[PDB]
Structures are given as C-alpha cells and as structure tokens.
Short mmCIF file of C-alpha atoms in Angstrom, two decimals:
data_model
loop_
_atom_site.label_atom_id
_atom_site.label_comp_id
_atom_site.label_asym_id
_atom_site.label_seq_id
_atom_site.Cartn_x
_atom_site.Cartn_y
_atom_site.Cartn_z
CA UNK A 1 23.15 -20.82 29.42
CA UNK A 2 20.01 -22.05 31.02
CA UNK A 3 17.05 -21.08 33.13
CA UNK A 4 19.28 -18.60 34.92
CA UNK A 5 20.15 -17.09 31.47
CA UNK A 6 16.42 -16.92 30.66
CA UNK A 7 15.70 -15.09 33.94
CA UNK A 8 18.61 -12.59 33.37
CA UNK A 9 17.30 -12.21 29.75
CA UNK A 10 13.78 -11.49 31.02
CA UNK A 11 14.97 -8.81 33.57
CA UNK A 12 17.44 -7.14 31.20
CA UNK A 13 14.94 -7.60 28.29
CA UNK A 14 12.34 -5.51 30.33
CA UNK A 15 15.02 -2.93 31.00
CA UNK A 16 16.75 -2.64 27.66
CA UNK A 17 13.47 -3.16 25.68
CA UNK A 18 11.93 -0.22 27.55
CA UNK A 19 15.06 1.95 26.97
CA UNK A 20 16.85 0.94 23.74
CA UNK A 21 13.98 -0.36 21.57
CA UNK A 22 11.69 2.78 22.04
CA UNK A 23 14.24 5.38 20.98
CA UNK A 24 15.71 3.36 18.02
CA UNK A 25 12.16 2.64 16.78
CA UNK A 26 11.22 6.26 17.18
CA UNK A 27 14.24 7.25 15.04
CA UNK A 28 13.38 4.49 12.61
CA UNK A 29 9.90 5.87 12.21
CA UNK A 30 11.25 9.36 11.83
CA UNK A 31 13.66 8.41 9.14
CA UNK A 32 10.95 6.28 7.51
CA UNK A 33 8.30 8.99 7.28
CA UNK A 34 11.11 11.03 5.80
CA UNK A 35 11.95 8.08 3.57
CA UNK A 36 8.39 7.68 2.04
CA UNK A 37 7.95 11.40 1.46
CA UNK A 38 7.98 11.50 -2.36
CA UNK A 39 9.19 15.04 -2.47
CA UNK A 40 12.26 14.76 -0.09
CA UNK A 41 13.65 11.51 -1.50
CA UNK A 42 15.36 13.64 -4.26
CA UNK A 43 16.60 15.86 -1.45
CA UNK A 44 18.49 12.80 -0.37
CA UNK A 45 18.69 9.33 -2.05
CA UNK A 46 22.02 8.98 -0.32
CA UNK A 47 21.49 9.63 3.42
CA UNK A 48 18.13 7.71 3.36
CA UNK A 49 18.91 4.06 2.22
CA UNK A 50 22.04 4.24 4.53
CA UNK A 51 19.87 4.84 7.62
CA UNK A 52 17.34 2.34 6.31
CA UNK A 53 19.98 -0.36 6.28
CA UNK A 54 21.36 0.68 9.58
CA UNK A 55 17.96 0.43 11.27
CA UNK A 56 17.35 -2.80 9.47
CA UNK A 57 20.46 -4.02 11.22
CA UNK A 58 19.00 -2.75 14.39
CA UNK A 59 15.90 -4.75 13.71
CA UNK A 60 17.92 -7.99 13.00
CA UNK A 61 19.59 -7.42 16.40
CA UNK A 62 16.07 -7.21 17.87
CA UNK A 63 15.35 -10.55 16.10
CA UNK A 64 18.51 -12.12 17.34
CA UNK A 65 17.67 -11.07 20.96
CA UNK A 66 14.13 -12.36 20.56
CA UNK A 67 15.53 -15.69 19.18
CA UNK A 68 17.91 -16.03 22.14
CA UNK A 69 14.93 -15.15 24.37
CA UNK A 70 12.21 -17.38 25.84
CA UNK A 71 11.27 -18.70 22.40
CA UNK A 72 7.96 -20.56 22.23
CA UNK A 73 6.07 -18.05 24.27
CA UNK A 74 7.46 -15.36 21.99
CA UNK A 75 6.10 -17.38 19.01
CA UNK A 76 2.73 -17.58 20.88
CA UNK A 77 2.18 -13.86 20.21
CA UNK A 78 0.61 -13.19 16.81
CA UNK A 79 2.16 -9.70 16.67
CA UNK A 80 5.56 -11.36 17.35
CA UNK A 81 4.85 -13.87 14.64
CA UNK A 82 4.25 -10.96 12.26
CA UNK A 83 7.55 -9.40 13.34
CA UNK A 84 9.34 -12.73 12.78
CA UNK A 85 7.98 -13.01 9.27
CA UNK A 86 8.82 -9.38 8.64
CA UNK A 87 12.39 -10.01 9.67
CA UNK A 88 12.78 -13.28 7.78
CA UNK A 89 11.59 -11.49 4.67
CA UNK A 90 13.82 -8.45 5.63
CA UNK A 91 17.04 -10.37 5.86
CA UNK A 92 15.96 -12.13 2.64
CA UNK A 93 15.83 -8.83 0.84
CA UNK A 94 18.99 -7.66 2.53
CA UNK A 95 21.10 -10.62 1.41
CA UNK A 96 19.49 -10.38 -2.07
CA UNK A 97 20.75 -6.78 -2.32
CA UNK A 98 24.08 -7.77 -0.71
CA UNK A 99 25.07 -10.70 -3.05
CA UNK A 100 24.71 -8.47 -6.24
CA UNK A 101 25.63 -10.26 -9.57
CA UNK A 102 22.44 -12.26 -10.13
CA UNK A 103 20.75 -12.93 -13.57
CA UNK A 104 17.21 -11.45 -13.28
CA UNK A 105 15.91 -7.97 -14.10
CA UNK A 106 16.56 -5.10 -11.65
CA UNK A 107 16.64 -1.26 -11.56
CA UNK A 108 13.26 -0.59 -9.99
CA UNK A 109 11.68 -4.05 -10.76
CA UNK A 110 8.57 -5.75 -9.53
CA UNK A 111 10.87 -7.39 -6.85
CA UNK A 112 11.97 -3.85 -5.88
CA UNK A 113 8.31 -2.75 -5.42
CA UNK A 114 7.83 -5.94 -3.37
CA UNK A 115 10.76 -4.82 -1.15
CA UNK A 116 9.25 -1.38 -0.91
CA UNK A 117 5.90 -2.66 0.41
CA UNK A 118 8.15 -4.83 2.54
CA UNK A 119 9.66 -1.73 4.08
CA UNK A 120 5.99 -0.57 4.39
CA UNK A 121 4.87 -3.28 6.74
CA UNK A 122 8.18 -2.84 8.54
CA UNK A 123 7.12 0.87 9.13
CA UNK A 124 3.68 -0.45 10.24
CA UNK A 125 5.31 -2.71 12.84
CA UNK A 126 7.45 0.27 13.95
CA UNK A 127 4.20 2.22 14.57
CA UNK A 128 2.54 -0.72 16.27
CA UNK A 129 5.53 -1.07 18.74
CA UNK A 130 5.57 2.77 19.20
CA UNK A 131 1.97 2.83 20.32
CA UNK A 132 2.64 0.84 23.63
CA UNK A 133 1.81 4.00 25.60
CA UNK A 134 -1.31 6.28 25.68
CA UNK A 135 -3.60 4.88 23.04
CA UNK A 136 -6.44 6.58 24.92
CA UNK A 137 -9.20 4.66 26.77
CA UNK A 138 -12.13 6.15 24.78
CA UNK A 139 -10.94 4.62 21.56
CA UNK A 140 -9.72 1.57 23.46
CA UNK A 141 -13.41 1.04 24.39
CA UNK A 142 -14.63 2.03 20.94
CA UNK A 143 -12.25 -0.52 19.25
CA UNK A 144 -13.25 -3.20 21.78
CA UNK A 145 -16.97 -2.72 21.25
CA UNK A 146 -16.36 -2.71 17.44
CA UNK A 147 -14.31 -5.97 17.51
CA UNK A 148 -16.87 -7.66 19.87
CA UNK A 149 -19.07 -8.85 17.12
CA UNK A 150 -16.60 -10.77 14.91
CA UNK A 151 -18.63 -13.91 14.08
CA UNK A 152 -21.56 -12.10 12.55
CA UNK A 153 -19.47 -9.85 10.31
CA UNK A 154 -17.33 -12.85 9.22
CA UNK A 155 -20.41 -14.86 8.35
CA UNK A 156 -21.87 -11.96 6.36
CA UNK A 157 -18.66 -11.31 4.41
CA UNK A 158 -18.32 -15.06 3.68
CA UNK A 159 -21.88 -15.17 2.42
CA UNK A 160 -21.31 -12.15 0.17
CA UNK A 161 -18.03 -13.76 -0.99
CA UNK A 162 -20.01 -16.76 -2.10
CA UNK A 163 -22.73 -14.47 -3.71
CA UNK A 164 -20.11 -12.36 -5.51
CA UNK A 165 -18.33 -15.48 -6.79
CA UNK A 166 -21.63 -17.00 -8.06
CA UNK A 167 -22.67 -13.75 -9.75
CA UNK A 168 -19.27 -13.39 -11.37
CA UNK A 169 -19.57 -17.02 -12.62
CA UNK A 170 -23.06 -16.50 -14.10
CA UNK A 171 -22.00 -13.13 -15.64
CA UNK A 172 -18.92 -14.64 -17.21
CA UNK A 173 -20.98 -17.44 -18.44
CA UNK A 174 -23.56 -15.18 -20.03
CA UNK A 175 -21.01 -12.83 -21.38
CA UNK A 176 -19.31 -15.37 -23.69
CA UNK A 177 -18.57 -13.82 -27.09
CA UNK A 178 -20.27 -10.63 -25.91
CA UNK A 179 -17.40 -8.11 -25.66
CA UNK A 180 -15.53 -9.40 -22.67
CA UNK A 181 -12.47 -7.16 -23.36
CA UNK A 182 -13.46 -5.73 -19.97
CA UNK A 183 -13.60 -9.07 -18.14
CA UNK A 184 -11.53 -11.47 -20.31
CA UNK A 185 -10.24 -13.38 -17.29
CA UNK A 186 -11.27 -14.13 -13.69
CA UNK A 187 -9.53 -11.17 -12.15
CA UNK A 188 -11.19 -8.78 -14.44
CA UNK A 189 -14.55 -10.41 -14.09
CA UNK A 190 -14.39 -10.18 -10.30
CA UNK A 191 -13.22 -6.59 -10.53
CA UNK A 192 -16.25 -5.66 -12.73
CA UNK A 193 -18.29 -7.43 -10.08
CA UNK A 194 -16.52 -5.21 -7.52
CA UNK A 195 -17.53 -2.18 -9.66
CA UNK A 196 -21.25 -3.21 -9.77
CA UNK A 197 -21.13 -3.89 -6.05
CA UNK A 198 -19.59 -0.39 -5.46
CA UNK A 199 -21.96 1.54 -7.78
CA UNK A 200 -19.30 2.51 -10.33
CA UNK A 201 -20.74 3.19 -13.89
CA UNK A 202 -23.17 0.36 -13.90
CA UNK A 203 -25.49 2.82 -15.65
CA UNK A 204 -22.57 3.00 -18.07
CA UNK A 205 -22.72 -0.82 -18.29
CA UNK A 206 -26.36 -0.61 -19.20
CA UNK A 207 -25.82 2.02 -21.87
CA UNK A 208 -22.95 0.20 -23.57
CA UNK A 209 -24.66 -3.15 -23.22
CA UNK A 210 -27.80 -2.01 -24.99
CA UNK A 211 -25.32 -0.44 -27.38
CA UNK A 212 -24.68 -4.17 -28.03
CA UNK A 213 -27.23 -6.74 -29.25
CA UNK A 214 -28.00 -8.29 -25.87
CA UNK A 215 -30.85 -6.69 -23.78
CA UNK A 216 -31.98 -9.40 -21.36
CA UNK A 217 -28.61 -9.30 -19.54
CA UNK A 218 -29.65 -5.90 -18.14
CA UNK A 219 -32.66 -6.98 -16.08
CA UNK A 220 -30.71 -9.94 -14.65
CA UNK A 221 -27.80 -7.55 -13.76
CA UNK A 222 -30.30 -5.09 -12.14
CA UNK A 223 -32.07 -7.66 -10.05
CA UNK A 224 -28.73 -9.11 -8.82
CA UNK A 225 -27.52 -5.55 -8.03
CA UNK A 226 -30.52 -4.62 -5.99
CA UNK A 227 -30.84 -7.86 -4.09
CA UNK A 228 -27.21 -8.17 -3.06
CA UNK A 229 -27.00 -4.41 -2.31
CA UNK A 230 -29.97 -4.19 -0.07
CA UNK A 231 -29.25 -7.50 1.70
CA UNK A 232 -25.63 -6.91 2.42
CA UNK A 233 -25.75 -3.25 3.29
CA UNK A 234 -28.81 -3.69 5.50
CA UNK A 235 -27.36 -6.76 7.20
CA UNK A 236 -24.06 -5.16 8.08
CA UNK A 237 -25.67 -1.85 9.15
CA UNK A 238 -28.22 -3.55 11.45
CA UNK A 239 -25.56 -6.02 12.80
CA UNK A 240 -23.23 -3.15 13.88
CA UNK A 241 -26.17 -1.07 15.15
CA UNK A 242 -27.06 -3.75 17.54
CA UNK A 243 -23.43 -4.55 18.27
CA UNK A 244 -22.97 -1.17 19.77
CA UNK A 245 -26.58 -1.00 21.00
CA UNK A 246 -26.03 -3.75 23.61
CA UNK A 247 -22.99 -1.63 24.80
CA UNK A 248 -25.39 1.35 24.86
CA UNK A 249 -27.87 -0.51 27.00
CA UNK A 250 -24.97 -1.54 29.36
CA UNK A 251 -22.97 1.06 31.30
CA UNK B 151 -13.11 9.74 17.91
CA UNK B 152 -14.40 7.92 14.79
CA UNK B 153 -12.90 10.67 12.65
CA UNK B 154 -9.50 10.21 14.50
CA UNK B 155 -9.50 6.36 14.16
CA UNK B 156 -10.54 6.55 10.47
CA UNK B 157 -7.85 9.10 9.66
CA UNK B 158 -5.18 7.09 11.64
CA UNK B 159 -6.09 3.87 9.78
CA UNK B 160 -6.14 5.82 6.54
CA UNK B 161 -2.68 7.07 7.09
CA UNK B 162 -1.15 3.71 8.15
CA UNK B 163 -2.71 2.14 5.07
CA UNK B 164 -1.51 5.17 2.95
CA UNK B 165 2.11 4.18 4.00
CA UNK B 166 1.20 1.09 1.87
CA UNK B 167 -0.17 3.31 -0.83
CA UNK B 168 2.78 5.71 -1.18
CA UNK B 169 5.07 2.76 -1.78
CA UNK B 170 3.10 2.26 -5.07
CA UNK B 171 2.79 5.95 -5.68
CA UNK B 172 4.88 8.81 -7.16
CA UNK B 173 6.46 9.23 -10.60
CA UNK B 174 4.38 6.33 -11.75
CA UNK B 175 0.60 6.26 -12.41
CA UNK B 176 1.04 9.92 -11.48
CA UNK B 177 -0.74 13.27 -10.96
CA UNK B 178 -3.31 11.87 -8.55
CA UNK B 179 -1.09 9.45 -6.46
CA UNK B 180 1.72 11.99 -6.15
CA UNK B 181 2.37 15.05 -3.93
CA UNK B 182 1.15 13.11 -0.72
CA UNK B 183 -1.77 15.46 -0.19
CA UNK B 184 -3.31 14.76 -3.60
CA UNK B 185 -2.70 11.02 -2.98
CA UNK B 186 -4.34 11.16 0.45
CA UNK B 187 -7.35 13.04 -0.91
CA UNK B 188 -7.72 10.78 -3.91
CA UNK B 189 -7.74 7.84 -1.63
CA UNK B 190 -10.32 9.78 0.41
CA UNK B 191 -12.36 10.13 -2.82
CA UNK B 192 -12.16 6.41 -3.36
CA UNK B 193 -13.26 5.95 0.29
CA UNK B 194 -16.30 8.22 -0.56
CA UNK B 195 -16.75 5.44 -3.17
CA UNK B 196 -18.23 7.00 -6.30
CA UNK B 197 -16.94 7.00 -9.84
CA UNK B 198 -13.38 5.64 -9.35
CA UNK B 199 -13.37 3.92 -12.77
CA UNK B 200 -11.48 6.91 -14.10
CA UNK C 845 19.89 20.87 -23.51
CA UNK C 846 16.29 21.88 -23.67
CA UNK C 847 15.09 18.69 -25.41
CA UNK C 848 17.22 16.58 -22.97
CA UNK C 849 15.65 18.36 -19.99
CA UNK C 850 12.19 17.82 -21.33
CA UNK C 851 12.98 14.13 -21.88
CA UNK C 852 14.05 13.78 -18.34
CA UNK C 853 10.99 15.61 -17.13
CA UNK C 854 8.86 13.25 -19.28
CA UNK C 855 10.46 9.84 -18.65
CA UNK C 856 10.99 9.81 -14.81
CA UNK C 857 8.69 12.92 -14.48
CA UNK C 858 10.97 14.69 -12.08
CA UNK C 859 14.22 16.66 -12.06
CA UNK C 860 16.67 18.07 -9.54
CA UNK C 861 19.78 20.08 -10.16
CA UNK C 862 23.01 19.95 -8.08
CA UNK C 863 23.48 21.96 -4.86
CA UNK C 864 25.77 24.41 -6.61
CA UNK C 865 23.36 25.29 -9.45
CA UNK C 866 24.87 26.52 -12.67
CA UNK C 867 22.86 27.80 -15.65
CA UNK C 868 25.25 26.80 -18.42
CA UNK C 869 25.91 23.31 -16.93
CA UNK C 870 22.98 21.26 -15.69
CA UNK C 871 23.22 18.24 -13.33
CA UNK C 872 21.83 14.74 -13.98
CA UNK C 873 20.65 12.23 -11.47
CA UNK C 874 21.75 8.49 -11.54
CA UNK C 875 18.23 7.18 -10.91
CA UNK C 876 16.95 8.82 -14.13
CA UNK C 877 17.46 7.09 -17.52
CA UNK C 878 19.82 9.22 -19.57
CA UNK C 879 18.88 9.93 -23.21
CA UNK C 880 20.70 12.75 -24.91
CA UNK C 881 19.55 14.52 -28.09
CA UNK C 882 21.81 16.38 -30.45
CA UNK C 883 21.61 19.44 -32.73
CA UNK C 884 23.55 20.33 -35.91
CA UNK C 885 24.12 24.05 -36.20
CA UNK C 886 25.29 25.68 -39.43
CA UNK C 887 27.15 28.87 -38.35
CA UNK C 888 27.21 30.27 -41.97
CA UNK C 889 23.40 30.42 -42.05
CA UNK C 890 20.35 30.36 -39.81
CA UNK C 891 19.10 26.93 -39.64
CA UNK C 892 19.41 24.50 -36.73
CA UNK C 893 18.64 20.82 -37.43
CA UNK C 894 18.50 17.67 -35.28
#
C-alpha cells in the first residue's frame, strides 16, 4: 500500500521473521545435512529432493516477502545481496528443472554439479541465518581482532599475486619445448606454481628436470622459491603477530 | 577457540567439498570422515600431488 | 547376475537392494546405468560361455 504498509510490514516482519523463518531454516538445515550425507542419499533419493524443493519454495516466499519489504535498505546489506543472488540463481535452476524438454546434456551433468554447489551456498546461507543467536563473545572478539588488519593482508596477497604471475610467466617462457605436458596451458602453469609455493614435490621437479637436458632452470627455480617463500611467510606471520599484539597491549 | 573456529570453517567449506565428492574421484573424498580427514591432510599441506 | 552386480559396483561404485530383500531376485536403482551381461549354458555338458 504505502508507508503504512511498510510500517506494518516492519512490525510483522520482526514477529514472523523471528518465529517462522527460524524454524523453517532449522528444518531446511536438518534436511540438508541429511541431504549431503553421501551414505544416506541411497536410503532416500525420493524423500530428499521433495523436501529440498519444498524448502526452496519456502525460500522463494522469503524472497517475495523481502521484495515487498523496504527494498533499498534491504539491498544495502551485503548478506542480503548474497541471499538475493542465491535466490535468483535458485529460481533459475528450479525453472530449468521444471521446463524439462530442452536440447542439452543432462543426467548428472556439469550443470547439475553447478546446481549442487548452488544448493551448497544455499545451505551456507541457512547456517548464516541460523547463527543469529549465541555466537559466543570470545570468538566474537577473536574474529574482530583477526579482521581488524585487512589492508596489510590484502596488500601482501596482491603483491604475491603479482609475484606468482611474474614467476609463472618467466617459467612458462623458459619451459618452451622442455616437456610442458605438466604446464601446457596457463591454468596448469599457475597450478605448478601453486605446487612450488606450497612445497609439493619440487624436489621431484628437480630430479625430473635434471633427468632432462636443462640444468640452469633449477637454480633459478630455487632462488625464486626461497625468496618468495621467506618474504611472504615472514611478512604475513609478522603482520598478524603485531595485529593481535596491539590488542594484547590494550585491555 | 582457534581449534573450534578452524573446525567450523572447515565443516562449512566441506559442505562445498562433499557436493563434488562421493562415487566420483572416490576412496578419499567419500565416506565423509575420510573426505574430512583428507581435506585436513591437504590443510597440513604436504604431498598432495597424489 | 554376478557379472551384472560387479558392473553396477564398478560403474556407479555403489549398490542398494530393495527394502524386501530377495536372494534370487536383486533390485536395481534408477540412478545407476543398466548394463546386463548374458550367459549361454549347455545343459548336456559342463561348459558355461558368455
């Protein structure tokens, strides 16, 4: 209606959102932790997707209520924006299942896996709206003091993103016609860079590279490994040490 | 408390994992305790190229 | 029956019978791809071919 409808919606939103949403989301999370459960889905597969679709209908009712609600201030909440994207995507997959017919591949396809991880962040949002009460103040303070120093960690991760990209570029450049069957594309090159950054069989890289005819690629790889390892690990460790050390010096 | 927070984040990100897991790339991502502990091995971050 | 059961246990890597379990008649799930295998038995002699 108007402002009067908005005020009635606010009051009844408080009441019915405290009452109805909590119990239906608790039941949704119960049926979803029974859903995932890759032993009990065969003790099922017929009472599980039914409840999944029923509570997805409950969620689209939540979305309809939030749409008829105050609106722009609802959009101003990032968690509510995540819920809005989750429900647009959810009604998209629901109508995709509903229309049937179609002309693309199905029967547990890549799109089906996409809809499964879609149900996954739906379960995550169910958890995040269940945890409205009693998160416990000790870990409240721990999480706040952890999230206090965001600019330093973002700068450090950006600098190592640049360094990892540069090292991947030079390694792919120097590995041309030198058995790149492990890093034939940009994804596999950056994943091998992830392995060397995470200390995973880079000694094996050394042994099967000196099994090849190139030997000077090993000292370059080593010096890059040690410099980026020491610099990044030490910088992050010291940054978080001090980040909680000011909170230590305070009360 | 750090143990509790790490385990809770580990579970809520394993909900993402188990959607990819079971009956495909199996025998370490299946059974939901083996999957959790294999992801814990990958958290301990040594020799996951197998 | 045995080869079909091994094929079901090797393709989808899982199997579940019905609620009313019967030895002579096994139960098949929809979600599993169905691939029968067939034997030729010669009652006059011993052999059993595929």
